[PDB]
Design a protein around this ligand. Structure first.
Ligand code: HEM
Ligand SMILES: Cc1cc(C[C@@H]2NC(=O)[C@H](Cc3ccc(O)cc3)NC2=O)cc(C)c1O
Length: 394
């Protein structure tokens, strides 16, 4: 007697389990048990993953409903699962999205300067260097402070909420609320701080005092800052970290991008496609009975969209495990999701990784792992897959 297949399959972010391809082939929508004990449908083909993500009847909002089958425990207030809907309802979606593009004057230079400064410090200190804790995450953190308009020196404290905020836990996490409430208070103070005039929080601080937004809650303004800082920092830091691994493990690609940095955008797009940073399928709750492949998903059931199921689907990306800079459909992966909840920070996330990689390859053209790959320690029960340290030499 066997138990129902458990998700997630593996917290390792350096390789996809052979099991995913067998699952996709045999049962692209399959029942699984999540860490809470709930049952769910795990969708692992490109076609079915896009179907689910493009059908809003598979609702993100409704995953927060009391009594729903859960992937993991909420680490935010339930109304925050509807964060982008709340932002849209408040009339803030266009301004938010405009503030988080990589387009602001000087932002890319700041990113480059920050990356180069981080790297110089690593070079000064001498190998081995930890490229997660001492490069990718600080770069993500610095970027998001700059984007939000908040002091760089406030970044580390906000950052250290994230090892708990993005836990994938069977049970509510006491520290998540402590940190959430504290971080909200911080962002509320930011909105009241007259020195904060730039970035997302500077713009929100002005809109908050504009009569066209006088009935938007202060809670939502503060929430936008906390949520965009955290989702952005965890996602860019984790993605860049695991992209660096994939790059370091491909010396020929490393050398090609070092030699021809104009291919870095195509290389990052493939690193996005093969990225295993999201540790769990994206969750959605059926609000109707909906046919997905051979399964009639019933109203109230949980569906988990396995990004790497889609992104390594050979029917969509031939030779899926190979980084190919000349694919005909290069941005068609689901690394940034798809549909209603497509990542609003996609461009910023691309540029963060492009600039970080560009700077790394210039400063450390010899970069290599300083430990055997198997020695990386993969964070467990977390919504991202990340090695706790990424020791390199160069
Ligand atoms: C490479 C970096 C990133 C990756 C791989 C990534 C990935 C994703 C994915 C897959 C989703 C969809 C979640 C879902 O549908 O359930 C998403 C949503 C989101 N991302 Fe990104 N992300 C990245 C960078 C960023 C950045 C830089 C920001 C903000 C500055 C950000 C903010 C968000 C937010 C707020 C959402 C939720 C949108 C919503 O609920 O509708 N992300 N991200
Ligand atoms: C876990 C998670 C959820 C969403 C949907 C939704 N929308 C949001 O904007 C925030 C993101 C978030 C920010 C800070 C934090 O501590 C926990 C979650 N919360 C939500 O529930 C989206 C993404 C990308 C995600 O990783």
């Amino acid at each position: 007697a066997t138990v129902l297949l458990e998700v997630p399959f593996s917290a390792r972010g350096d390789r996809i389990p052979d099991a995913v391809a067998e699952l996709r082939t045999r049962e692209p929508i399959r029942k699984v048990r999540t860490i809470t004990g709930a049952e769910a449908w795990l969708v692992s083909s490109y076609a079915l993953c896009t179907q689910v993500l493009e059908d809003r009847r598979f609702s993100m909002k409704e995953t927060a409903a009391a009594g729903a089958p859960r992937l993991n425990a909420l680490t935010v207030p339930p109304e925050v699962v509807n964060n982008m809907g709340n932002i849209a309802d408040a009339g803030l979606r266009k301004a938010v999205m405009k503030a988080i593009t990589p387009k602001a004057p000087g932002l890319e230079q700041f990113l480059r300067d920050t990356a180069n400064s981080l790297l110089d410090n690593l070079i000064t200190e001498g190998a081995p260097a930890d490229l997660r804790n001492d490069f990718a995450d600080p770069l993500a953190t610095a970027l998001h402070c700059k984007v939000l308009g908040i002091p760089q020196e406030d970044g580390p404290k906000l950052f250290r909420s994230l090892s708990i905020a993005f836990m994938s836990s069977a049970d509510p996490i006491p520290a998540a609320k402590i940190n959430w409430d504290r971080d909200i208070e911080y962002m509320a103070g930011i909105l009241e701080n007259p020195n904060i005039t730039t970035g997302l929080m500077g713009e929100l601080s002005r809109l908050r005092k504009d009569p066209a937004y006088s009935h938007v809650s202060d809670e939502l303004f503060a929430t936008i800052g906390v949520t965009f800082f955290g989702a952005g920092v965890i996602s860019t830091g984790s993605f860049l970290t695991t992209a660096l691994i994939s790059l370091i493990q491909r010396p020929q690609l490393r050398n090609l991008l070092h030699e021809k940095p104009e291919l870095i955008p195509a290389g990052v797009e493939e690193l996005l496609r093969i990225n295993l940073s999201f540790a769990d399928g994206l969750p959605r709750l059926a609000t109707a009975d909906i046919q997905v492949g051979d399964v009639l998903v019933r109203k109230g059931e949980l569906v988990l969209v396995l990004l790497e199921g889609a992104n390594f689907d050979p029917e969509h990306f031939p030779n899926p495990g190979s980084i190919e800079l000349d694919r005909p459909n290069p941005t068609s992966h689901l690394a940034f999701g798809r549909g209603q909840h497509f990542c609003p920070g996609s461009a910023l996330g691309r540029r963060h990784a492009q600039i970080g990689i560009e700077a790394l390859l210039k400063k450390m053209p010899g970069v290599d792992l300083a430990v055997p790959i198997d020695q990386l320690v993969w964070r467990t029960r977390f919504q991202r897959r990340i090695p706790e340290r990424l020791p390199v030499l160069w």
